[PDB]
Design a protein around this ligand. Structure first.
Ligand SMILES: CC/C=C/CC/C=C\C=C\CCC/C=C/CCC(=O)OC[C@@H](COP(=O)(O)OC[C@H](O)CO)OC(=O)/C=C/CCCCC/C=C/CC/C=C/CC
Ligand SMILES: CC/C=C/CC/C=C\C=C\CCC/C=C/CCC(=O)OC[C@@H](COP(=O)(O)OC[C@H](O)CO)OC(=O)/C=C/CCCCC/C=C/CC/C=C/CC
Ligand SMILES: CC/C=C/CC/C=C\C=C\CCC/C=C/CCC(=O)OC[C@@H](COP(=O)(O)OC[C@H](O)CO)OC(=O)/C=C/CCCCC/C=C/CC/C=C/CC
Ligand SMILES: CC/C=C/CC/C=C\C=C\CCC/C=C/CCC(=O)OC[C@H](COP(=O)(O)OC[C@@H](O)CO)OC(=O)/C=C/CCCCC/C=C/CC/C=C/CC
Lengths: 470, 470
């Protein structure tokens, strides 16, 4: 039981954080009808979590080296679980935003430690390959369970949806206490000066990006915050040259395979994030399956993805990460080509929608394990901290960049085919049909980004005896 | 002057075959007004040329070994030039059909000899690379010059357009005679039984594939035509086992890098053929440029292609055919993504149409040179005949296969967007707008087929020392 209890506990924060993201999105309209927070406050509950989760990520990367990775994992999760209760008792806009702020602080501390715990706890070999599959398995499980939970326990109250994290979170705190052993190495000094500038630079950059669309791109306060971030970013690099125990080891990023792998995960995250957002919007708006029925209909995705991850964990020892990334990428290509020809409003569920989801899930799951193992290959125990923190930063940061281009193509083609921009419930059956054909057309431009991802994967060059097979 | 006159004469049949093909398509509607051979006779003049050109392709490969490579190239061109004069004096469908039949026979003899002449005449190294670029360069020149000649000298008569091949064709016979030296090796016995079975199989398959859409797929004679095609093909393989100097050396095609490099050009030719048909139809119908203006507007394509071919000849000695094929093909991906977003009816010619054509021309030209050098590498002199005939047979055969799939996607999406199937001259500006967006949508599926070509190009693995640099 020691093995299964360890992989479940380590990947728990991936289950918790991803599930919370979808439930908060689903319950947003009912928050309007109760708190009466207006349209300006609608975005302030979402970006409040993102403000601290991305701002504190680098600080939480080096936090486990000076205190302890296991202690960091329990503390970070506990603050996440406590914050959910404070989120479900919110009475005023100030109460909710502060509750969402502290969830990001709790997530930023524990999330990078989860990836680092895979490399240190499990030795290189079949154990790490099985641990990588489980770590990637429950990220998609939380997303699907988020739709089912958020689509079922929402008509009685949005407050009960946030209270489902507590039973799940308490188990992972219990499992991590009795299934993970505290390692014994001497603690190292924290880069306090480096962490101060790194935190205030990423938080300012996210604040400027969020306030842009609201107050205008050239309001005067947005540029002022960007100037502060650019001044901090310049100073942060300067100190790191002669700073012991760097937050970011720039010397570790050379012309080696590390840049190619870290550039691939930056773009591969954007392809996956944009694919999830567009498919969920297409099913809920064009097909009208709502939250509950869409989540149950995505159950085959988890089973197919679980099949792909389990198979890829066996083949990684024999095949290089280059061929498994491409091999699973071609199964993705056939899914969205078949998912473009056979999608309009009113099609049956089994002949038309089941196959693209199942086949695409196997291809996606096949290429996740080789990419994860190569990003934590040949780094060591003193430097696995910041490397894991950077890997989760680039994976999440690439999402909005790619989706911004994809959503621009969707909007442009809607106008050309004949349509309007606005809420969907106010669109007759010619502007609605144009939006149907716009999303399907934009599914092919997602494949255009996937080709770019695969082209960068040609330069990995890792052999199977380095990433695995030890 | 010896070098430039030699290579021009070698690639001369490529100029003739492509340019005559385009002119025959352009002047087809005027043949209706004069010969009055009805709809059923419209497709016979196109079918008649293809029936013998593809039917006698395999015979022409081994015909140069038993007779002479230079002598075969002269008679093949001479019969082509002669048949153009008889074509332009046609006075009934029977006279025009016979002339088109004889034009294919002359082309089937000289076309495979042109590619074989590249390998034997020029020694492997810098001389072959420069000769390869000019060989591919004049294939694209003939296509554009066919539009201008057939779009300008056709308002006076369709008979004058057919007589423009004689001044050019007579020059090619002169340059070949003066600038090509007759090699001195002993002639070999021709496989009489194999040549008879090879000829009958291809014409029967072409005849069945042509009468199918006309008379019905299960009409009764198409299955009979398919019966002799299978009977000839089955006996051809049986008798080829013990046949001296085989027509098709099956033993040469093993699990080595030759089957991969022959499957790539099978589908690369289909992508390039479907790109020309779709673009030419889109420009003439949606934009209404007619034939003369379309030919002038595609002049920058040839200039851009010439730059791509010239650069690729220098780089092929330092880079393998794998990287140049994948690297050159990414420029094609960028052009067709740009050409899908910024191309509708009524756009200016400069910013929206010239840029994708110029960039796409460079990308195509960079990938053509490595593919043909790999297709004639390391075979010898006693087997360069059949191998070059197969390379031209598969390149032409892949065209209709890929285009049939693309045209099915275009027709399916036209109906969904709102529109009908029929002549463009009866549209109510609403079905015309839908046909505009259907062609643009189908441009991305051509990119999907080009991705498959890239995938097979990863298995080439030819060293630049083997295909060049000697
Ligand atoms: C090593 C460093 C880091 C490693 C750490 C990383 C470790 C592993 C991570 C891997 C990737 C992400 C995990 C997966 C998360 C989400 C996936 C999921 O399970 O979530 C369900 C849904 C989301 O939706 P959701 O966002 O909730 O929607 C709500 C709206 O926003 C408003 O309510 O996604 C999907 O089903 C995905 C479907 C793609 C399959 C391919 C189909 C192609 C053809 C389909 C045609 C249909 C027509 C579409 C026409 C466009
Ligand atoms: C070694 C083995 C063998 C080696 C032996 C062979 C050695 C090398 C041979 C390679 C392949 C063929 C060469 C090229 C031949 C044709 C190309 C050409 O020069 O011909 C011009 C025109 C043809 O037209 P044509 O067919 O005459 O038209 C008539 C109508 O059918 C009815 O009159 O094509 C083009 O301009 C091609 C443009 C492609 C550039 C990239 C475009 C991307 C953006 C597109 C946006 C536009 C919107 C499209 C929306 C869909
Ligand atoms: C932390 C992890 C996160 C998990 C996040 C979860 C997401 C993970 C997803 C991973 C999928 C990526 C794989 C991408 C597969 C694509 C394959 C590829 O990358 O392959 C490139 C292709 C080969 O290249 C091309 O584009 C081909 C261009 C055209 C080819 C050349 C044609 C030009 C000549 C024309 C005619 C010449 C005449 C011939 C006459 C002979
Ligand atoms: C095969 C097993 C099972 C099959 C089983 C078959 C059944 C179905 C299919 C299964 C999966 C397919 C396998 C995909 C394999 C691909 C990986 C690969 O085999 O790769 C080849 C080559 C080797 O490399 P090399 O190390 O020399 O050789 C060592 C090896 O031969 C062994 O040791 O990779 C390259 O170099 C790539 C060359 C292209 C140059 C890049 C330029 C274009 C991109 C520009 C910028 C990027 C994008 C930016 C913005 C767009």
């Amino acid at each position: 039981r020691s093995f299964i209890a360890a992989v479940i506990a380590i990947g728990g924060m991936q289950l918790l954080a991803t599930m919370d993201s979808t439930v908060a999105i689903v319950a947003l309209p009912k928050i309007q009808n109760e708190l009466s927070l207006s349209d300006a406050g609608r975005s302030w509950v979402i970006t409040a979590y993102v403000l601290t989760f991305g701002g504190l990520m680098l600080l939480g990367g080096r936090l486990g080296d000076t205190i302890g990775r296991k202690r960091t994992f329990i503390v970070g999760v506990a603050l996440f679980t406590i914050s959910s209760v404070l989120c479900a008792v919110a009475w005023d806009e100030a109460t909710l935003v502060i509750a969402r702020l502290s969830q990001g602080v709790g997530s930023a501390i524990a999330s990078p430690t989860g990836l680092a715990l895979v490399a240190t706890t499990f030795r290189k070999g079949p154990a790490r390959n099985a641990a990588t599959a489980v770590f990637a398995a429950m990220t998609a499980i939380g997303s699907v369970m988020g739709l089912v939970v958020g689509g079922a326990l929402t008509e009685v109250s949005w407050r009960w949806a946030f209270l489902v994290n507590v039973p799940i979170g308490l188990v992972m705190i219990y499992l991590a206490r009795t299934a993970l052993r505290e390692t014994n190495k001497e603690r190292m000094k924290l880069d306090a000066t480096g962490a101060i500038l790194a935190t205030l630079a990423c938080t300012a950059a996210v604040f400027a990006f969020s306030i842009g669309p609201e107050k205008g791109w050239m309001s005067g306060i947005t540029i002022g915050s960007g100037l502060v971030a650019l001044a901090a970013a310049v100073a942060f690099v300067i100190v790191e040259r002669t700073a012991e125990n760097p937050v970011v080891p720039f010397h570790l990023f050379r012309d080696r395979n590390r840049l190619v792998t870290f550039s691939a995960i930056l773009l591969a995250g954007g392809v996956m994030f944009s694919l999830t957002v567009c498919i969920g919007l297409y099913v809920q708006d064009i097909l009208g399956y709502s939250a509950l029925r869409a989540g149950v209909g995505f159950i085959p995705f988890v089973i197919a993805m679980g099949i792909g991850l389990g198979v890829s964990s066996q083949l990684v020892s024999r095949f290089s990460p280059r061929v498994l990334t491409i091999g699973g990428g071609y199964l993705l290509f056939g899914a969205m080509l078949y998912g473009s020809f056979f999608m309009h409003r009113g099609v049956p569920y089994f002949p038309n929608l089941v196959m693209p989801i199942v086949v695409g899930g196997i291809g996606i799951g096949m290429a996740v394990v080789p990419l994860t193992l190569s990003a934590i290959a040949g780094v060591g125990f003193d430097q696995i901290g910041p490397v894991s923190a950077i890997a989760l930063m680039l994976q999440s940061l690439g999402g909005p960049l790619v989706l911004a281009v994809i959503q621009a193509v969707i909007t442009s083609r809607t106008l050309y085919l004949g349509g309007t921009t606005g809420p969907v419930k106010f669109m007759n059956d010619v502007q609605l049909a144009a939006l149907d054909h716009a999303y399907t057309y934009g599914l092919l431009w997602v494949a255009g980004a996937a080709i770019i991802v695969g082209g960068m994967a040609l330069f990995i060059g890792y052999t199977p005896q380095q990433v695995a097979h030890a």
